[PDB]
Coordinates of C-alpha atoms in Angstrom, one line a residue:
Chain Z
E1 CA -19.2 1.6 16.2
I2 CA -16.2 3.2 15.7
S3 CA -11.5 5.1 5.4
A4 CA -9.5 2.2 4.2
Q5 CA -8.2 2.1 0.8
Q6 CA -7.1 -0.5 -1.5
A7 CA -5.5 0.1 -4.8
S8 CA -7.0 -2.2 -7.3
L9 CA -4.6 -3.7 -9.5
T10 CA -3.9 -2.5 -13.0
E11 CA -4.9 -6.1 -14.5
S12 CA -8.1 -6.0 -12.5
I13 CA -11.4 -12.6 -16.1
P14 CA -9.0 -12.1 -13.1
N15 CA -11.1 -11.5 -10.2
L16 CA -13.1 -14.2 -11.0
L17 CA -10.4 -16.9 -12.0
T18 CA -6.8 -16.3 -10.9
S19 CA -7.8 -14.2 -7.8
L20 CA -10.1 -15.9 -5.9
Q21 CA -8.3 -19.3 -6.8
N22 CA -5.4 -17.8 -4.7
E23 CA -7.7 -16.9 -2.0
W24 CA -8.9 -20.0 -1.3
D25 CA -5.7 -21.8 -2.1
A26 CA -4.1 -19.9 0.4
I27 CA -7.0 -20.7 3.1
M28 CA -7.0 -24.1 2.5
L29 CA -3.0 -24.8 2.9
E30 CA -2.5 -22.5 5.5
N31 CA -4.9 -23.9 8.1
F32 CA -3.9 -27.3 6.6
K33 CA -0.3 -26.5 7.8
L34 CA -1.1 -24.7 10.5
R35 CA -3.6 -28.1 12.2
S36 CA 0.3 -29.6 11.7
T37 CA 1.2 -27.1 13.6
Chain R
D1 CA -32.6 36.5 -40.8
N2 CA -33.4 35.2 -37.9
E3 CA -36.7 34.2 -38.6
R4 CA -36.2 32.5 -41.7
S5 CA -33.8 30.1 -40.0
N6 CA -36.5 29.2 -37.7
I7 CA -38.6 28.5 -40.4
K8 CA -35.9 26.5 -42.1
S9 CA -34.8 24.2 -39.8
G10 CA -38.3 23.2 -38.4
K11 CA -39.3 22.1 -41.6
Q12 CA -36.2 20.7 -42.9
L13 CA -37.1 17.5 -41.3
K14 CA -39.5 15.9 -38.7
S15 CA -36.5 13.1 -37.8
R16 CA -33.4 14.6 -38.8
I17 CA -34.2 17.6 -36.2
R18 CA -35.3 15.1 -33.5
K19 CA -32.5 12.7 -33.1
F20 CA -31.5 9.4 -34.5
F21 CA -27.9 4.4 -42.0
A22 CA -26.0 3.5 -45.2
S23 CA -26.8 4.3 -48.6
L24 CA -28.4 1.6 -50.5
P25 CA -29.9 1.6 -54.1
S26 CA -29.8 -1.8 -54.0
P27 CA -31.9 -2.0 -50.8
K28 CA -34.2 0.4 -52.4
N29 CA -34.4 -1.6 -55.9
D30 CA -35.0 -5.0 -53.3
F31 CA -37.3 -3.7 -51.8
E32 CA -39.7 -2.7 -54.3
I33 CA -39.2 -5.8 -56.5
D34 CA -45.3 2.7 -53.9
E35 CA -45.7 4.1 -50.6
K36 CA -42.3 2.8 -49.0
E37 CA -40.4 3.5 -52.7
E38 CA -41.1 7.4 -51.6
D39 CA -40.1 6.8 -47.7
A40 CA -36.8 5.4 -49.3
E41 CA -35.9 8.0 -51.8
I42 CA -36.8 10.3 -48.8
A43 CA -34.1 9.2 -46.7
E44 CA -31.5 9.1 -49.6
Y45 CA -32.5 13.1 -49.8
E46 CA -32.3 14.0 -46.5
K47 CA -29.2 12.1 -46.0
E48 CA -27.1 13.8 -48.5
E49 CA -22.4 4.7 -54.0
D50 CA -25.0 7.1 -53.2
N51 CA -26.6 10.0 -55.5
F52 CA -27.8 12.8 -54.6
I53 CA -30.5 14.9 -56.3
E54 CA -34.1 16.1 -54.5
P55 CA -34.0 19.0 -53.0
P56 CA -36.9 20.6 -53.6
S57 CA -39.9 19.4 -51.8
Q58 CA -40.0 19.8 -48.2
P59 CA -44.3 24.2 -43.5
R60 CA -47.8 25.7 -43.7
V61 CA -48.7 23.0 -46.1
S62 CA -47.3 20.2 -43.7
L63 CA -49.5 22.2 -40.9
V64 CA -52.8 21.4 -42.2
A65 CA -51.6 17.9 -43.4
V66 CA -50.9 17.2 -39.9
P67 CA -54.5 18.8 -38.8
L68 CA -56.4 17.0 -41.2
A69 CA -54.9 13.9 -39.9
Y70 CA -55.2 14.6 -36.5
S71 CA -59.2 14.7 -37.4
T72 CA -59.1 11.5 -39.3
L73 CA -57.6 9.4 -36.1
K74 CA -60.0 4.5 -23.3
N75 CA -60.7 1.8 -26.0
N76 CA -57.4 3.5 -28.9
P77 CA -55.6 3.4 -25.7
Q78 CA -55.9 0.3 -24.5
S79 CA -55.5 -1.3 -28.0
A80 CA -52.2 0.0 -28.9
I81 CA -51.3 -1.3 -25.2
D82 CA -52.0 -5.0 -26.4
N83 CA -50.0 -4.1 -29.5
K84 CA -47.1 -2.5 -27.9
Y85 CA -47.4 -6.1 -26.0
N86 CA -47.4 -8.3 -28.4
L87 CA -44.5 -6.7 -30.7
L88 CA -42.6 -6.9 -27.3
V89 CA -43.3 -10.8 -27.2
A90 CA -41.9 -10.8 -30.6
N91 CA -38.8 -8.7 -29.9
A92 CA -38.1 -10.8 -26.8
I93 CA -39.0 -14.0 -29.4
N94 CA -36.0 -12.9 -31.7
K95 CA -33.9 -12.3 -29.8
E96 CA -34.2 -15.7 -27.6
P97 CA -33.6 -17.8 -30.8
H98 CA -30.1 -16.0 -32.2
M99 CA -28.7 -16.4 -28.5
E100 CA -23.8 -15.3 -41.1
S101 CA -24.9 -13.0 -37.9
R102 CA -21.9 -15.1 -35.9
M103 CA -19.5 -13.6 -38.1
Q104 CA -20.3 -10.1 -37.9
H105 CA -20.4 -10.0 -33.3
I106 CA -16.8 -11.7 -33.6
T107 CA -15.5 -9.1 -36.1
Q108 CA -17.1 -6.7 -33.9
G109 CA -15.3 -8.3 -30.8
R110 CA -12.1 -7.4 -33.1
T111 CA -12.4 -4.1 -33.1
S112 CA -13.4 -3.8 -29.6
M113 CA -10.6 -6.4 -28.6
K114 CA -8.0 -3.8 -30.9
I115 CA -9.8 -0.5 -29.9
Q116 CA -10.0 -1.8 -25.9
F117 CA -6.9 -3.6 -25.1
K118 CA -4.5 -1.1 -26.7
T119 CA -6.3 1.5 -24.5
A120 CA -5.8 -1.4 -21.8
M121 CA -2.3 -1.8 -22.7
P122 CA -1.8 1.9 -22.5
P123 CA -3.6 2.5 -19.3
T124 CA -1.6 -0.2 -18.1
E125 CA 1.7 0.8 -19.1
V126 CA 1.2 4.1 -18.0
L127 CA 0.0 3.0 -14.6
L128 CA 2.5 0.7 -14.2
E129 CA 5.6 3.3 -15.3
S130 CA 4.0 5.2 -11.7
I131 CA 2.7 2.3 -10.0
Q132 CA 5.0 -0.7 -10.3
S133 CA 7.2 1.7 -8.2
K134 CA 4.4 2.2 -6.1
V135 CA 3.7 -1.6 -5.7
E136 CA 7.5 -2.1 -4.7
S137 CA 7.3 0.7 -2.2
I138 CA 3.9 -0.8 -0.6
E139 CA 4.9 -4.7 -1.5
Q140 CA 8.4 -3.9 0.4
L141 CA 6.2 -2.2 3.4
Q142 CA 4.1 -5.5 3.6
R143 CA 7.5 -7.4 4.0
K144 CA 8.4 -5.7 7.2
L145 CA 5.0 -6.4 8.8
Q146 CA 5.8 -9.8 8.6
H147 CA 9.1 -9.6 10.2
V148 CA 7.8 -6.9 12.7
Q149 CA 5.3 -9.8 13.7
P150 CA 7.7 -12.6 13.6
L151 CA 10.0 -10.9 16.1
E152 CA 6.7 -9.5 18.2
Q153 CA 6.2 -13.2 19.2
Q154 CA 9.2 -13.8 20.2
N155 CA 9.8 -11.1 22.1
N156 CA 6.8 -12.1 23.7
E157 CA 7.6 -15.7 24.2
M158 CA 10.4 -14.5 25.8
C159 CA 9.0 -11.4 27.9
Chain O
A1 CA -9.2 -32.4 1.1
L2 CA -8.0 -29.7 -1.2
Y3 CA -4.7 -29.5 1.1
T4 CA -4.4 -33.0 1.5
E5 CA -4.4 -34.0 -2.1
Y6 CA -2.6 -30.6 -3.1
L7 CA -5.2 -30.0 -6.0
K8 CA -6.9 -26.7 -6.6
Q9 CA -10.4 -26.8 -7.8
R10 CA -9.8 -26.0 -11.8
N11 CA -11.9 -22.9 -12.8
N12 CA -13.2 -21.3 -15.9
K13 CA -10.5 -21.3 -18.6
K14 CA -12.4 -19.9 -21.3
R15 CA -13.0 -16.7 -21.9
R16 CA -9.1 -16.3 -22.7
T17 CA -9.2 -19.2 -25.6
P18 CA -12.1 -18.9 -28.0
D19 CA -12.5 -19.2 -31.7
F20 CA -14.3 -17.4 -34.3
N21 CA -16.7 -19.0 -37.0
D22 CA -17.6 -21.3 -33.9
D23 CA -21.4 -22.2 -33.3
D24 CA -23.8 -21.0 -31.1
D25 CA -22.1 -21.7 -28.2
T26 CA -19.4 -19.4 -29.5
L27 CA -21.9 -16.9 -30.6
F28 CA -22.1 -17.1 -26.6
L29 CA -18.6 -17.3 -26.1
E30 CA -17.8 -14.2 -28.2
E31 CA -20.6 -11.9 -26.9
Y32 CA -19.0 -12.8 -23.0
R33 CA -15.7 -11.2 -24.4
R34 CA -17.1 -8.0 -25.6
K35 CA -19.3 -7.1 -22.1
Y36 CA -16.3 -8.0 -19.9
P37 CA -13.7 -6.2 -22.3
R38 CA -16.1 -3.1 -22.1
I39 CA -16.5 -3.3 -18.2
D40 CA -12.8 -4.4 -18.6
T41 CA -12.3 -0.5 -19.9
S42 CA -14.5 0.8 -18.2
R43 CA -12.7 -0.6 -14.9
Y44 CA -9.9 1.0 -16.5
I45 CA -11.1 4.6 -16.7
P46 CA -12.2 4.8 -12.7
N47 CA -8.7 3.7 -11.6
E48 CA -6.6 6.2 -14.1
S49 CA -8.8 9.4 -13.2
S50 CA -7.8 8.9 -9.5
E51 CA -4.2 7.3 -10.6
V52 CA -1.6 7.5 -8.7
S53 CA -3.3 9.6 -5.8
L54 CA -5.6 6.6 -4.6
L55 CA -2.4 4.5 -4.4
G56 CA -0.1 6.9 -2.5
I57 CA -3.0 7.2 0.0
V58 CA -3.1 3.8 0.9
Chain F
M1 CA -40.8 -8.3 -2.3
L2 CA -38.5 -6.3 -5.1
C3 CA -36.6 -3.5 -5.5
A4 CA -37.6 -1.7 -8.1
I5 CA -33.8 -0.9 -9.5
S6 CA -31.6 -3.7 -9.5
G7 CA -34.7 -6.8 -9.5
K8 CA -32.7 -8.2 -6.2
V9 CA -35.1 -9.0 -2.6
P10 CA -33.7 -6.2 -0.6
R11 CA -32.2 -6.6 2.5
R12 CA -32.1 -3.3 4.4
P13 CA -34.9 -1.1 1.5
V14 CA -35.6 2.4 2.3
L15 CA -38.8 3.9 0.8
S16 CA -39.0 7.4 -1.4
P17 CA -42.0 10.0 -0.2
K18 CA -42.0 11.6 -3.5
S19 CA -43.1 8.1 -5.3
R20 CA -44.7 5.4 -3.5
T21 CA -42.0 2.9 -4.0
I22 CA -39.3 0.3 -1.7
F23 CA -35.9 0.3 -2.8
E24 CA -32.4 -0.7 -1.9
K25 CA -30.5 1.8 0.6
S26 CA -27.3 1.2 -1.5
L27 CA -28.9 2.1 -4.8
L28 CA -30.9 4.6 -4.0
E29 CA -28.2 6.7 -2.7
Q30 CA -26.0 6.5 -5.7
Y31 CA -28.9 7.4 -7.7
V32 CA -29.0 10.5 -5.2
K33 CA -25.6 10.9 -5.5
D34 CA -25.6 11.5 -9.4
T35 CA -28.5 13.3 -9.2
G36 CA -31.2 14.7 -6.6
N37 CA -34.1 12.5 -8.2
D38 CA -36.6 9.9 -8.1
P39 CA -35.6 6.6 -10.6
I40 CA -39.2 6.2 -11.9
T41 CA -41.1 9.5 -11.3
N42 CA -38.1 12.1 -11.4
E43 CA -39.1 14.4 -8.6
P44 CA -36.9 16.1 -6.6
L45 CA -35.7 13.8 -3.5
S46 CA -32.9 13.8 -1.1
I47 CA -31.0 11.2 0.9
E48 CA -32.9 12.4 4.4
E49 CA -36.2 12.3 2.6
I50 CA -35.8 8.3 2.7
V51 CA -37.7 6.0 5.4
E52 CA -35.7 3.2 6.2
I53 CA -38.6 0.3 5.4
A54 CA -39.5 -12.2 5.3
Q55 CA -35.3 -13.0 4.8
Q56 CA -35.2 -17.1 3.4
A57 CA -32.0 -18.6 3.4
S58 CA -31.0 -20.2 0.3
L59 CA -29.8 -23.7 1.1
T60 CA -28.1 -24.9 -2.4
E61 CA -28.2 -28.6 -1.8
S62 CA -25.7 -31.1 -0.6
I63 CA -17.8 -26.4 -2.7
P64 CA -15.2 -27.1 -5.9
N65 CA -18.9 -27.0 -8.1
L66 CA -20.4 -24.0 -6.3
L67 CA -17.3 -22.3 -8.0
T68 CA -18.2 -23.0 -11.0
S69 CA -21.3 -22.5 -10.3
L70 CA -20.7 -18.6 -9.9
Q71 CA -18.9 -18.3 -12.8
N72 CA -21.6 -19.5 -14.8
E73 CA -24.0 -17.3 -13.2
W74 CA -21.9 -14.5 -13.6
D75 CA -20.8 -15.9 -17.0
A76 CA -24.9 -15.9 -17.7
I77 CA -25.9 -12.5 -16.3
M78 CA -23.3 -10.5 -18.8
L79 CA -25.3 -11.9 -21.3
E80 CA -28.8 -11.5 -20.4
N81 CA -27.3 -7.8 -19.5
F82 CA -26.1 -7.8 -23.1
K83 CA -29.2 -8.7 -25.1
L84 CA -31.1 -6.1 -23.7
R85 CA -29.4 -3.5 -24.9
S86 CA -29.1 -4.7 -28.5
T87 CA -32.6 -5.1 -28.2
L88 CA -33.1 -1.7 -27.2
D89 CA -30.7 0.0 -29.7
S90 CA -32.6 -1.9 -32.3
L91 CA -36.2 -0.9 -30.8
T92 CA -34.6 2.5 -31.5
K93 CA -33.6 2.0 -34.6
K94 CA -37.0 0.6 -36.1
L95 CA -38.6 3.1 -34.5
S96 CA -36.3 5.8 -36.3
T97 CA -37.3 4.2 -39.7
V98 CA -41.2 4.6 -39.1
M99 CA -40.6 8.4 -38.0
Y100 CA -39.3 9.0 -41.8
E101 CA -41.8 7.2 -43.3
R102 CA -44.6 9.0 -41.2
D103 CA -43.4 12.4 -42.4
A104 CA -42.4 11.3 -45.8
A105 CA -46.3 10.4 -46.3
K106 CA -47.8 13.4 -45.0
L107 CA -45.9 15.1 -48.0
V108 CA -47.2 12.4 -50.4
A109 CA -50.5 13.2 -49.1
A110 CA -50.4 17.3 -49.7
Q111 CA -49.3 16.2 -53.7
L112 CA -52.9 14.0 -53.5
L113 CA -54.6 16.6 -52.2
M114 CA -53.5 19.1 -54.9
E115 CA -54.7 15.9 -57.3
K116 CA -57.9 16.1 -56.0
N117 CA -58.4 19.7 -56.0
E118 CA -57.4 20.1 -59.6
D119 CA -59.9 17.5 -60.3
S120 CA -62.7 19.4 -58.5
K121 CA -61.8 22.3 -60.5
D122 CA -62.3 20.4 -64.0
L123 CA -65.5 19.0 -62.7
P124 CA -67.3 22.0 -62.2
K125 CA -66.2 23.4 -65.6
Chain M
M1 CA -4.2 8.9 11.1
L2 CA -5.8 12.1 12.3
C3 CA -6.4 13.2 16.0
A4 CA -10.2 14.8 15.7
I5 CA -9.5 17.8 18.5
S6 CA -5.8 19.1 16.8
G7 CA -5.9 17.5 13.7
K8 CA -2.4 16.3 14.0
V9 CA -1.0 13.1 13.1
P10 CA -1.0 11.4 17.2
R11 CA 1.9 10.3 18.1
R12 CA 0.4 8.2 21.5
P13 CA -3.5 7.3 20.2
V14 CA -6.1 6.0 22.2
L15 CA -9.5 5.0 21.3
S16 CA -12.6 6.2 23.5
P17 CA -15.2 3.8 24.7
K18 CA -18.6 5.6 24.2
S19 CA -18.0 8.2 21.3
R20 CA -15.6 5.5 18.7
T21 CA -13.0 7.8 17.5
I22 CA -8.9 7.9 17.3
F23 CA -7.9 10.4 20.0
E24 CA -4.2 11.6 21.0
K25 CA -3.8 10.5 24.0
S26 CA -1.7 13.9 25.5
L27 CA -4.5 15.7 23.6
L28 CA -7.7 13.5 25.7
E29 CA -6.0 13.2 28.5
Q30 CA -6.0 17.1 29.4
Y31 CA -9.8 17.2 27.8
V32 CA -10.6 14.3 30.6
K33 CA -9.6 16.4 33.3
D34 CA -10.9 19.7 32.0
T35 CA -14.4 17.7 32.8
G36 CA -15.0 13.9 32.5
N37 CA -16.6 14.0 28.7
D38 CA -15.8 12.7 25.3
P39 CA -15.4 16.2 23.4
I40 CA -17.5 15.0 20.5
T41 CA -20.8 13.4 22.0
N42 CA -20.6 15.0 25.3
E43 CA -21.4 11.6 26.8
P44 CA -19.3 10.9 30.4
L45 CA -15.6 9.4 29.7
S46 CA -12.3 8.7 32.7
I47 CA -9.0 8.1 31.6
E48 CA -9.3 4.4 32.4
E49 CA -12.3 4.0 29.8
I50 CA -9.9 5.5 27.3
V51 CA -7.7 2.5 25.6
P52 CA -5.1 -7.6 18.1
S53 CA -3.4 -10.5 20.6
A54 CA -2.1 -13.9 18.7
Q55 CA -3.9 -14.0 15.1
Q56 CA -1.0 -12.1 12.8
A57 CA -2.8 -9.9 9.9
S58 CA -1.7 -8.6 7.0
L59 CA -2.8 -5.7 5.0
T60 CA -6.4 -4.8 3.3
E61 CA -5.8 -5.3 -0.3
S62 CA -7.5 -6.3 -3.6
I63 CA -10.8 -12.1 0.3
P64 CA -13.3 -10.2 2.1
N65 CA -12.0 -7.0 0.5
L66 CA -12.8 -9.4 -2.8
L67 CA -16.1 -10.5 -1.8
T68 CA -16.9 -6.6 -1.2
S69 CA -15.3 -5.8 -4.6
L70 CA -18.2 -8.2 -6.5
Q71 CA -20.5 -6.0 -4.5
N72 CA -19.6 -3.0 -6.5
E73 CA -19.5 -5.0 -9.7
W74 CA -23.2 -6.0 -9.5
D75 CA -24.7 -3.4 -8.0
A76 CA -23.3 -1.3 -10.7
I77 CA -24.4 -3.1 -13.4
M78 CA -27.9 -3.5 -12.1
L79 CA -28.2 0.5 -12.4
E80 CA -27.0 0.0 -15.8
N81 CA -30.3 -1.9 -16.2
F82 CA -32.1 0.8 -15.2
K83 CA -30.9 3.2 -17.8
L84 CA -32.1 1.2 -20.3
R85 CA -35.0 -0.2 -18.9
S86 CA -36.0 3.1 -18.5
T87 CA -35.2 4.1 -22.0
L88 CA -37.0 1.4 -23.5
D89 CA -40.3 2.4 -22.0
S90 CA -40.0 6.1 -23.6
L91 CA -38.6 4.2 -26.7
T92 CA -41.7 1.5 -27.0
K93 CA -44.5 4.2 -25.9
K94 CA -43.4 6.7 -29.1
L95 CA -43.2 3.5 -31.4
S96 CA -47.3 2.9 -29.5
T97 CA -48.3 6.2 -30.6
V98 CA -46.0 6.5 -33.8
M99 CA -47.6 3.0 -35.2
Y100 CA -50.9 4.0 -34.6
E101 CA -50.6 7.3 -36.6
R102 CA -49.0 5.3 -39.3
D103 CA -52.3 2.5 -38.9
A104 CA -54.8 5.9 -38.4
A105 CA -52.9 8.0 -41.5
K106 CA -52.5 5.0 -44.3
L107 CA -56.5 4.4 -43.8
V108 CA -56.6 7.9 -45.6
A109 CA -53.5 7.9 -48.1
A110 CA -55.9 4.8 -49.3
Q111 CA -58.6 6.8 -49.5
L112 CA -56.8 10.3 -51.3
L113 CA -55.8 7.4 -53.9
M114 CA -59.4 6.0 -54.7
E115 CA -60.6 9.6 -54.4
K116 CA -57.8 11.5 -56.7
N117 CA -58.4 8.5 -59.1
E118 CA -61.9 8.2 -59.1
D119 CA -61.9 12.2 -59.8
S120 CA -59.5 11.5 -62.9
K121 CA -61.7 8.3 -64.0
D122 CA -65.2 11.0 -63.6
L123 CA -63.8 13.3 -65.2
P124 CA -61.7 12.4 -68.4
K125 CA -65.1 9.8 -69.3
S126 CA -67.4 13.6 -69.7

């Protein structure tokens, strides 16, 4: 075994709805497009 | 003068001095319609549609009153633990049925929505002013990785 | 299937709209908005405390 | 089986030596970082005091639905936390109404004892 | 970002494979040439021991970072419940003793209301 900071957005509801939705969209449409490649 | 202040603060009120209401003469009128009426006037007096008046009643007489009642009062510990569980079940039953009253909660939220979202919008716009600049700083730097990577592969490929 | 069809699964579009004088259903929906708004206002407090220091460090 | 802070099944439980209580490593640490104490007994305890001490995987059933489950479960826990706090405020509120009557009653006994004292003097005469 | 030996921003970072820590190559090289060891743990290390591929990464921002976020949410809210579980056990314990002292006292109010009126009923008749 061998700190990282992410600044949680000012408008941080969205984490359940909008952010999580985009993450599984971005995972889905990339790997499908990667399978196409 | 320090001794006199120590006598007045302690003998002012047991509930008021220790820790945590709106004035209601109609509630006192509705509740009556004798001991209940005595505590109602006692609450209206200490608090001071509300008239104040009683200020000559509330240390030695209270100590003897407390010592006498203590004399009158394993088996006593279990009867209090059983009754406390019964009242706890009645409190969990009154809460499960609810989940007139609904209009008050929505208005409580409208206060919150107002108070909180105004704070949110001020916290947001204060942050945004400082952080939209730093977002652009951070986000335009991210785009540099996406070009620093894409060139990397073409050079590795060509290598 | 999601990528092929080009359709993302719908999330809970409920908390945002709601309506006053509803019923037992909107009594819940109302009480949801309160707790999350308090969590929100607490979630904005610990951000502003540090403020721009946490951002510029990243 | 249950950590006595959250109610979860602990995935890295740690026991306090001042009071016999298996907590979860994450939750006990946050409490000690807030104030150097044990949450149950309020005894002086530190992070080095802790001694690091069943795992059965949930197979929900036969993914878009699992999105809405997690939505509902957070939606439920938010209300199960809310309902438990308004009840605490109203049990304290109704407790405060009892304290006023308790102290108001023992003032009313003082006047009743005077009426008894006045009566005992008249009976003797 | 820092070198653990000097404290500067290292311009050629090389990570060791015995005590995992980012050292500056020019600094750690001299440490190894002094004696074959890792400066932190004092375990053996040589220069060859000191050191992604094809998958492209993006910076750590607000899926995995989102999942660890939701742990912070729930783990904090779980402590919020303790503040109300512990405070409930004090209020109900004070309520139990309060209602018991109320129930033990009101029997004495009932007897004094009897005795003071009985003394008035007795005396007035005589």
